[PDB]
């Protein structure tokens, strides 16, 4: 009778960039979801497929917790069937996604005077990302027809660019911490029930 560790994904001292989002495995636990749903501390709490309203009486094979940080105006992009730089090049969700997305403001921690530039996102790519894909390549992007030869000159760009987070920005330019809980059900253990 051991409860799930959610203070390791939610109450985490450091979050990851959107292009290199972090993933955690949670299994063999007594996970309680009423604490999260009834905490009155999260701005966005949306569940697709499953109903959050007192469905803590279900069992799943495995739980994936994917966490990262984005800007506010892009929080609506973390959803099935969304377009934009984040959805196409950084983080993609399947059309038939079942699971929950929790987002909360992180201005008091992730915004710094003069700008906090520790979070990065991909601006260019040859094609869009697949669901749950993760690209960490640093090859320079060629917007022209002449080979770039590994140098960022004319039509040669660094595909990764850093956010600028400041405490005085508007809500669309303020940092937001995002956690996605994805549930997998296989034909054996069903080890994640959480009464």
């Amino acid at each position, epitope marked *: 009778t051991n409860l799930c560790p959610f203070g390791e994904v939610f109450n985490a001292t450091r979050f990851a960039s959107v292009y290199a989002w972090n993933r955690k495995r949670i299994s063999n636990c007594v996970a309680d979801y009423s604490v999260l749903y009834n905490s009155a501390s999260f701005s966005t709490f949306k569940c697709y497929g499953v109903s959050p309203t007192k469905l803590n009486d279900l069992c799943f094979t495995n739980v994936y917790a994917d966490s990262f940080v984005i800007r506010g105006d892009e929080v609506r992009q973390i959803a099935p069937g969304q377009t934009g730089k984040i959805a196409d090049y950084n983080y993609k969700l399947p059309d038939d996604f079942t699971g929950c997305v929790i987002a909360w403001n992180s201005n008091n921690l992730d915004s710094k005077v003069g700008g906090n530039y520790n979070y990065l996102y991909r601006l260019f790519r040859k094609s869009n990302l*697949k*669901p749950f894909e*993760r690209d960490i390549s640093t090859e320079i992007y060629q917007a022209g027809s002449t080979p770039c030869n590994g140098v960022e000159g004319f039509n040669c760009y660094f595909p990764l660019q850093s956010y600028g987070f400041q405490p005085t920005n508007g809500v669309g330019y303020q940092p937001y911490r995002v956690v996605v809980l994805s549930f997998e059900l296989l034909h*054996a253990p069903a080890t994640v029930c959480g009464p």
Partner: antibody
Amino acid sequence: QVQLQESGGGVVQPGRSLRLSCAASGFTFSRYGMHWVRQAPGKGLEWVAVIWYDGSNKYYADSVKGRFTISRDNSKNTLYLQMNSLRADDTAVYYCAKQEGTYCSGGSCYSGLDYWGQGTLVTVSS
Amino acid sequence: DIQMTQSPSSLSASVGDRVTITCRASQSISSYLNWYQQKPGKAPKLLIYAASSLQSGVPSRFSGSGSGTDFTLTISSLQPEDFATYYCQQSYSTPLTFGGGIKVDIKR
């Protein structure tokens, strides 16, 4: 009760062709990428080919490039390998493997192999 | 390609001791490493994926760690059923490559 089962192994004369199938049960086939592995008698493990969840991209090893073709039919829950221009160095046990995680499973649609078949023996001789 | 080197190819240990195995790489593969067991005449089956994550059903004594180009695997309690051949695989880019493998035997 997740299960994978291979079929098609046997003897074949050099220069001919062969076809191998693996069928799956216990999970949603269309969400996962699949791999082929082989093990020579007395030798170690060697990776052969990979196909993605939706079948867009296909990749093979250099020792079999231009001869082996991988495909998937996930409306019938099956994965296929076609072997052409067989030499005597292709004698091995073949395993069909399912990777852990859905879709790209956290990176470039490649991840660890958590469910394996029992394998089939293919020997090329005369 | 990325060559995955596994050495030594043999090892001897006695029941109750701690066993450590090392796998080497040739380029940067981040944390895309996996460990497999194999007993004679049997399918491999997975022990640790993502270089630090246990698989469901594995006894809570196998532990794996490592990032970059060098990795390790630990047992910490050798049981009579822990005598097999161990393989390491990378899943960063194609062609995905296996290691040579190491065999653990009984000491007398």
